[PDB]
Amino acid sequence: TKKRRNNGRAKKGRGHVQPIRCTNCACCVPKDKAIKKFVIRNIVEAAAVRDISEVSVFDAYVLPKLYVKLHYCVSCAIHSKVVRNRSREARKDRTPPPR
Amino acid sequence: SLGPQVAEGENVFGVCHIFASFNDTFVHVTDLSGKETICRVTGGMKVKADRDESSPYAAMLAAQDVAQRCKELGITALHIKLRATGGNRTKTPGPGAQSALRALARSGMKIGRIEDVTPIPSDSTRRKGGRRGRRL
Amino acid sequence: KKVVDPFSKKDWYDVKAPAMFNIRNIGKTLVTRTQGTKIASDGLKGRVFEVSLADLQNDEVAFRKFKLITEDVQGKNCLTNFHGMDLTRDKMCSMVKKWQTMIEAHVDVKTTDGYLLHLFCVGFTKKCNNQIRKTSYAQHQQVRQIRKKMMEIMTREVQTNDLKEVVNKLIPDSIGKDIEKACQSIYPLHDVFVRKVKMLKKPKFELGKLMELHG
Amino acid sequence: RVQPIKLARVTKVLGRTGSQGQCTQVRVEFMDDTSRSIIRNVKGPVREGDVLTLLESEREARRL
Amino acid sequence: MRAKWRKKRMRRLKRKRRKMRQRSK
Amino acid sequence: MPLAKDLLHPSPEEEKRKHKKKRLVQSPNSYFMDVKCPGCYKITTVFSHAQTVVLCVGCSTVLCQPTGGKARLTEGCSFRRKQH
Amino acid sequence: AYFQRPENALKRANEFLEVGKKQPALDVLYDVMKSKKHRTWQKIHEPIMLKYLELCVDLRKSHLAKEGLYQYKNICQQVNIKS
Amino acid sequence: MGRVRTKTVKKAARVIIEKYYTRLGNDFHTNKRVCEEIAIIPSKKLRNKIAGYVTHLMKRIQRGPVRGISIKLQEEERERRDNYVPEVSALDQEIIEVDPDTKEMLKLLDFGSLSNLQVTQPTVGM
RNA sequence: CGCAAGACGGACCAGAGCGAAAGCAUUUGCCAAGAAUGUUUUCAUUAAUCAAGAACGAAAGUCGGAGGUUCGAAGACGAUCAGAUACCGUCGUAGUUCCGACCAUAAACGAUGCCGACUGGCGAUGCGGCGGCGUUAUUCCCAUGACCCGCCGGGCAGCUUCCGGGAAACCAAAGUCUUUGGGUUCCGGGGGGAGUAUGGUUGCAAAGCUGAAACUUAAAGGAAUUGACGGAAGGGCACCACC
């Protein structure tokens, strides 16, 4: 029968929600079914950090970070491999895997 | 080419306006005000193949020329403004963002500051592709 | 244009800031030399000049950027005037995060002079002293008080006190800090900033009032 | 390009890449700067401590 | 999609019969 | 439940901390109180959940305040139950 | 993070005083005396403490002049007393 | 390469060390000739293996105790740790006092000696 | 750098809240409405479920006006393909938006009627009330704020097991059922033929509701298990595989 109990990711007690668009399938899904991945990176990225930081005109100047909120859908998540197939008794976790 | 009459201990600061993402890279060095400007070079001018316009080395080769004409004039330092496409689009840098910096810095030019600027809506008009979106 | 040597036909300049700034040497620009079809000054006025606060005020802070417009030119020195302040993106982004309630309000306000301003502020809820709870959400009734009291403070201090004294209160942020303590009883709150101000209208040039700033 | 011929030496080998294992990731020390290091892709069989002949150090490796 | 099409081909066909009978009288 | 527990005779407040209509006998959770502050030198009697402003005949003209349950008194002691 | 060159505390302190606020201008001064900046007497720690005790006596805060001097003697311990 | 030892070696290697612990050296050749006399190994190549593993085990048995097999002197030191440890002979240090709410239990059970009082602050993690 | 037009409310925004359902996120004010909790107030059986009948009811569509940025059925092109009226790229009408009338349908799904009683454990979260060793706000001090701990209601949910049930998947309800009866409404009878035929009714239109038979056939369908297969995912291996 059902392969879920939530049948989404959450729609409990609520009749409807506003949908939201995938970033790379250009698709349309619910907000509370979409894979929500927030991202932190440095602007310059860490390979060329030494070559840049020395060439600063100043001294004490931490670098900015890059803040982006990404919403992926069901298909464009599996294909970019931020998620994968899991076992029958191993789908019952809600827990993110540690870094 | 005539620069200002002092730059010996100080620097003159331009703004670099690096453009990001796919099928294109611009580097467009301007005034502090940005009202007037100097040379403007693309990765479609360095490399012609219609498919390497977003490549790392095409962005590096661009800035490797632009940074010469800066110092030729008297512009020695650069504040940096970024631009990803945005406007309910990808809103994420291309490959040729990291690239041009590494090349232009080591060519000899100074870096003063760096920041993110991207046009991000507070929710605006519907995105091209339809309900089902692109597939294949 | 495509005139021969078009960066050897340009004329360098300097750009001077008000006396309130410790370092007044903003930087340098260039326009084309005078022709009778369009003169230097007409292509040099009405610009905007983004300048940082930790760069115009040596030195430390890394934001609170100010916009400055050239209203007058004087013999290779371009004098500036306030136009409105803005804030960086990354700072504004980093403070916004899950399990907080964001609080916002604005007002349209007039100065003692003819300047008119439209200030935008922000507050964030505090992740409290020794929560074991994983939320910091607040009631809706409580929020509408905090917004009311964030307008009350920011009108009192800007309706009185002329254009320059406004700027003087915003550079150390005395404005924002005053709100943080005044709202503390009804919810503690950490953070107050004024993310934008937009100079909407402004009065006549007024050369006498102008040169006061560059005195 | 207009850079003169550079010489840089291996410090460590990382692992093999490419779609048949034909490329080799390697870390190399610049041989004039001892705190500078770049990652490269090198075709031929290498050991460690041997010297290469780079035509540029603008190029940098990131994937297969 | 399949069932939704089988219901559609028979809809247009039913409409045609109506027209054809209305035409006959 | 230990599945053998007594229900004839309950504990004084460890089985009378329950909701008032889930007890064996229904009791109120309210009480009266004999007051007599100074603002109004008279022995007034007032219900705990006031529901309305109680007036004073002295210098004052307010004694209570109806909130969402019990009632916030004032700067006048005056307290008793008595008995119930 | 916070500060650097702990000498910026004076600037803020000075900036708030031009508005007429000695309650927070001081706070900024105290936020430094007690912090990672315990590098026992940098040359700028004297002008910080001189301004700090002027405002303590300009508003009347002994229990702050105690914490201020208590931090100062420490960093200025088996080092320099002339300060 | 390869040549990971099979179970037929590891089974008999343990046995041969348990019952002929004394005969062992730590040299290859001596431990070979012993295995040749205390047992017969029907091959020659097999003999050269079982000796080498018997040698490799005997290195580790002269350190802490192995968990696959037993010898006598380890069961001695086992017994010596498991009949008295030098840490205590006293129970536990003879006098230990407790804080209130334990004292209230003892009050209602006819005990009234050897106590201290500290009334530590509220509350959990706070 | 300035101006105009139309559209739209990001991040914050959550197995969170409110609504009968459909649904509902910028500020401030006004207009009427409602749940829960508190109460030693009032009335005194005034109730439960429902043919007839009635209100609301996504999106698309129809009629008459306003508007038309953006996206975009239709349509015209460019590629890909043996073919390609498609997936992909460019352009683009109706429509998308607002005002006034129609239309009554959806996987309108928890695929699970409504009301009542009884029967395990545990930790949370939203709202009200009550009890408390303390930190914390301010005016210096029990106004009522924030954080901590416990208790009592009703609400969205979760975890746990030889409660019990089920064909199993699973479910503190789908439990208290051959030891069968708390109250009541609606509805089902192998698979096709067929939501077709036909007559009635409603609608401007599109269609909606109501709804057969002749004839045909021994399987259709559900859950679960073992294999094989996958232009599914993760490991490992071969010069009859590659480099």
Beta strands, E only, F1-84: 32-34, 45-47
Q: What are phi and psi of B23, to 5 degrees?
A: 80, 25
Alpha-carbon distance of B108 to B110, in angstroms, equals 7
Indicate which of B46, B47, B57 best probes the interface with D, i.e. most D CBs within 10 Å of its own CB: B57
Q: Residue C208: enclosing H or E segment and its boundaries?
A: helix C207-213
Which residues from chain D sit within 8 angstroms of residue A55, using beta carbons?
none
Which of C165, C156, C160, C167 has its CA nearest to residue C194?
C167
Give CA C197 to chain center in angstroms: 6
A 10 A CB-CB count for H119 gives 7
Query: A69: which 2 tokens?
Result: 């909120």
Residue F42 vs residues A41, F55, F79, F82: alpha-carbon distances, Å: 74, 12, 13, 17
Within 10 Å of residue G69's Cβ, how many Cβ atoms? Answer: 16
Q: Which among A28, A34, A32 is positioned nearest to A14, based on CA atoms?
A: A32
- Residue F47, beta-bridge partner list: F32
CB contact under 8 A, A51 and B105: yes
> Half-sphere exposure (CA, 13 Å, Cβ side) for C110?
4
Per the CB < 8 A criterion, the answer to whether C56 and C17 are in contact is yes
CB G82, CB G45: distance < 8 Å: no
Nearest-Å Rg of the Cα atoms of chain F is 18
With 0-12 / 13-18 / 19 or more C-beta atoms within 10 angstroms meaning exposed / middle / buried, residue H89 is: exposed
In chain H, after which residues is the C-to-N distance over 2.5 Å, breaking the chain? none
Tell me if A62 and G4 make a contact (CB, 8 A cut-off). Answer: no
Question: Cα–Cα distance between G7 and B80 in angstroms, integer?
Answer: 29
Give the span between the Cα atoms of A38 and A22, in whole angstroms.
Answer: 14
For residue B13, give the DSSP letter.
E
Q: Is B77 helix (H, G, I), strand (E, B) or coil?
A: strand
Residues with Cβ within 8 Å of D27's Cβ and at least 6 positions away in sequence, in order, are D10, D11, D12, D13, D14, D37, D38, D39, D40
Instruction: Print burial letters for C177-213: b (CB count within 10 Å at least 16), e (below 16).
Output: bbbbebbeeebebeebbbbebbbeebeeeeeeeeeeb
- Residue B80 CA: distances (Å) to CA of A52, B19, B65, B116: 13, 11, 17, 9
Rounded to whole angstroms, the Cα distance separating G47 from G33 reads 12
**Residue C56 · residue C1 · CB < 8 Å:** no
Give CA torsion, residues C69, C73, C76, C79, to 10 deg. Answer: -40
CA distance C37 to H121: 84
DSSP C49-115: --B-STTTSSS------EEEEEEEE-SSEEEEEEEEE---HHHHHHT--SS--EEEEEEEEE-SSS-
> Which distant-in-sequence residues (6+ apart) come within 8 Å of G83 by Cβ?
G41, G45, G46, G72, G76
Domain of H44 in residue numbering reads as 7-62
Q: Which chains touch F (3 or more CB pairs under 8 A)?
A: none
- Whole-number Cα distances in Å, C110 to C107, C159, C170, H86: 10, 6, 16, 85
d(CA A20, CA A39): 18
Q: Are G71 and G33 in contact (CB under 8 A)?
A: yes
Domains and CATH numbers, chain D: 3-64 (2.40.50.140)
With a CB cutoff of 8 Å and minimum separation 6, the contacts of B18 are B25, B26, B27, B80, B81, B82, B83, B97, B100, B101
CA distance B24 to B55: 9
Interface of C with G in 43-82 (CB under 8 A): 60
For every residue of chain H, which 3-state class applies, written as one string? Answer: CCCCCCHHHHHHHHHHHHHCCCCCCCCHHHHHHHHHHCCCCCCCHHHHHHHHHHHHHHHHHCCCCCCCCCCHHHHHHHHHHCCCCCCCCCCCCCCCCCCCCCHHHHHCCCCCCCCCCCCCCCCCCC
How many Cα atoms sit within 13 Å of F24 on the Cβ side?
9
What length does chain F have?
A: 84
- List, in order, residues 6 or more apart from G57 with CB less than 8 Å away: G65
CA distance C74 to B2: 22
Judged by C1' against the alpha carbon of C138, the nearest nucleotide is I146
Distance F58 CA to I40 C1' (A): 28
Those chains having 3 or more beta-carbon pairs within 8 angstroms of chain D are A, B
Q: How far is the CA of A25 from the C1' of I76 (A)?
A: 28
Judged by a CB distance cut-off of 8 A, whether residue B101 touches chain D is no
Our CA angle for C197, C202, C206, nearest 5°, is 135
Measured between alpha carbons, how far is H75 from D48 in angstroms, rounded to an integer?
A: 51
Taking the CB of residue F49, how many other CB atoms lie within 10 A of it? 15
Two structure tokens written together for G75: 């960093």
DSSP state, residue C185: T
Do residue C174 and residue G4 have CB atoms under 8 angstroms apart?
no
Q: Do B103 and D59 touch (CB under 8 A)?
A: no
Q: What is the dihedral of CA B111, B116, B117, B122, to 10 degrees?
A: -170
- For residue G16, the chain C residues in CB contact (below 8 A) are 172, 174
DSSP element (H, E) containing B101: helix B98-107
- Give the integer Cα–Cα distance in Å for C167 and C194: 12
What are the φ/ψ torsions at residue D25 (nearest 5 degrees)?
Answer: -70, 145
Task: Determine the topology of domain A1-98 in CATH.
Answer: first zn-finger domain of poly(adp-ribose) polymerase-1 (3.30.1740)
- Whether omega for the bond prior to residue B30 falls within 30 degrees of 0, making it cis, is no
Which CATH number belongs to the domain containing residue H28 in this structure?
A: 1.10.60.20
Query: CB atoms < 10 A from the CB of H28, how many?
Result: 14
Structure tokens at C182: 């005044």
How would DSSP label each residue in C25-51? EEE--EEEPPBTTB-TGGGTSS----B
Measured CA distances, A47 to A50, B99, D8, D34 (Å): 8, 11, 18, 16
> Which three-class secondary structure state does DSSP give residue D16?
strand
Q: Decide: helix, strand or coil at residue G63.
A: helix
Q: By what method was this entry solved?
A: cryo-EM
Phi, psi of E10 (to 5 degrees): -80, -20
Q: In chain A, whose CA is at the least distance from the CA of G5?
A: A60
Give the separation between CA G40 and CA C211, rounded to whole angstroms.
47
Residues G46 and G24: their CA atoms lie apart, in Å, by 19
HSE-CB for B11 with a 13 A CA cutoff: 18
What is the rounded distance in angstroms from the CA atom of residue D30 to the CA atom of residue A31? 50
From residue C126, how far is each of C129, C150, G49, G81, H107 by CA, in Å? 8, 16, 31, 42, 47
Give the neighbours of chain C: at least 3 Cβ pairs within 8 Å: A, B, G, H
Resolution of the experimentally solved model in angstroms: 3.6
Residue nearest to nucleotide I242 (CA to C1'): D20
Alpha-carbon distance C8 to B2, whole Å?
6
> Closest residue of C to B113, CA-based?
C62
φ, ψ of residue C73 to 5 degrees: the values are: -120, 145
Q: F63: exposed, middle or buried (C-beta count within 10 Å: 0-12, 13-18, 19+)?
A: buried
Q: Which residues, in sequence order, are bridge partners of residue D8? A: D52
Which of chain D's residues have a Cβ under 8 Å away from the Cβ of B57? Answer: 58-59
Look at residue F79 and give its three-state secondary structure.
coil
Distance CA B87, CA G72 (A): 55
Torsions phi, psi for A22 (to 5 deg): -65, 150
Could you tell me the CATH number of the domain that includes residue B34?
3.30.420.80
- CA dist C78 and C49 (Å) reads 11
- Return positions of chain I under 7 A from a protein CB: 1-2, 6-19, 21-29, 37-40, 69-73, 87-90, 110-111, 119-121, 124-131, 133-138, 142-149, 151-153, 156-160, 168-171, 194-198, 206-207, 222-224, 232-234, 242-243
Contact yes or no for C47/C27 (Cβ under 8 A): no
Consecutive H or E run containing B103: helix B98-107
> What distance in Å separates residue C177's CA from the closest CA in chain G?
9
Instruction: Give the residue carrying structure tokens 């502020």.
Output: C121
Contact G4 A60 (CB under 8 A): yes
Angle at A64 between CA A58 and CA A68, to 5 degrees: 165
Does A48 lie at the interface with B, CB-CB under 8 angstroms?
yes
Question: What are the tokens at H21?
Answer: 């612990």
Is residue A27 a known part of a binding site? no
- Token pair belonging to G58: 């300009």
Q: What is the separation, in whole angstroms, between the first and last Cα of chain A? A: 35
Dihedral sign computed on CA atoms, order F6, F8, F13, F16: positive
* Long-range CB contacts for residues D23-32, cutoff 8 Å, separation at least 24: D23/D64, D25/D61, D28/D52, D30/D6, D30/D57, D31/D7
Q: Which domain holds residue B112?
A: 2-136
Option in B91, B110, B133 nearest A25 (CB): B133
Burial D13-34 (b: 16+ CB within 10 A, else e): eeeeeeeeeebbbbebbbeeee
What are all long-range contacts of D30-37, with beta carbons under 8 Å and residues at least 24 apart? D30/D6, D30/D57, D31/D7, D35/A50, D36/A50, D37/D11
Binding residues of F for Zn(2+) are: 37, 40, 56, 59
What is the pairing mode between strands C14-16 and B37-42?
unpaired
d(CA C18, CA C25): 10
What is the phi/psi pair of residue G10, to 5°?
A: -65, -45
Indicate yes or no: CB of C50 within 8 angstroms of CB of B32: yes
Q: Where are the beta strands (DSSP E) in C111-189?
A: 116-124
For chain H, what's the residue count?
126
Kindly give, in sequence order, each residue whose CB lies less than 8 Å from that of residue C175, ignoring residues fewer than 6 positions away.
C153, C154, C157, C169, C194
- Under a CB-based contact definition with an 8 Å cutoff, are residues H88 and H36 in contact? no
Determine the distance between C169 (CA) and I212 (C1') in angstroms.
87
Structure tokens of A36?
A: 């929500």
Phi, psi of B77 (to 5 degrees): -130, 165
Euclidean distance between CA atoms D38 and D58, whole angstroms? 10
Nearest residue of chain B to residue C51 (CA atoms): B32
Of B1, B36, B116, the CB nearest to C30: B36
Question: Which of G4, G11, G16 faces C174 most closely, judged by CB atoms?
Answer: G16
Determine the Cα angle at C199 with ends C194 and C205, to 5°: 145
Collect all residues of chain G within an 8 Å Cβ-Cβ radius of residue A60: 4-5
Distance CA(D46)–CA(G7), nearest Å, equals 54
Q: Where do the domains of chain F lie, and which CATH numbers do they carry?
A: 1-84 (2.20.25.100)
> Cβ distance B27 to B64 under 8 Å?
no
Domain ranges of chain A: 1-98
Number of Cβ atoms within 10 Å of the Cβ of A82: 12
Coil, strand or helix at D25: strand
The string over B66-97, giving b where at least 16 C-beta atoms fall within 10 Å of a residue's C-beta and e elsewhere, is bbeebeebbbbbbbbbbbbbbebebbbbbbbb
Report the protein residue whose CA lies nearest the C1' of nucleotide I108. A15
Residue located via tokens 């490419």: D18
The answer on whether A76 is annotated among ligand-binding residues is yes
User: Nearest nucleotide (C1') to the CA of residue A67?
Assistant: I11
Closest to G52 measured CA to CA, from G39, G42, G67: G67
Q: How many inter-chain contacts (B to D, CB under 8 Å) are there? A: 7
What's the full length of chain A, in residues?
Answer: 99
* Closest residue in chain G to residue A60, using alpha carbons only: G4
Of C88, C144, C84, the C-alpha closest to C109 is: C84
Instruction: Name the phi and psi angles at B73, rounded to 5.
Output: -90, -45
Q: Which one-letter DSSP state was computed for residue B113?
A: B
Q: Do chains C and E touch (3 or more CB pairs under 8 A)?
A: no
Only one residue has tokens 């091959």, namely H43
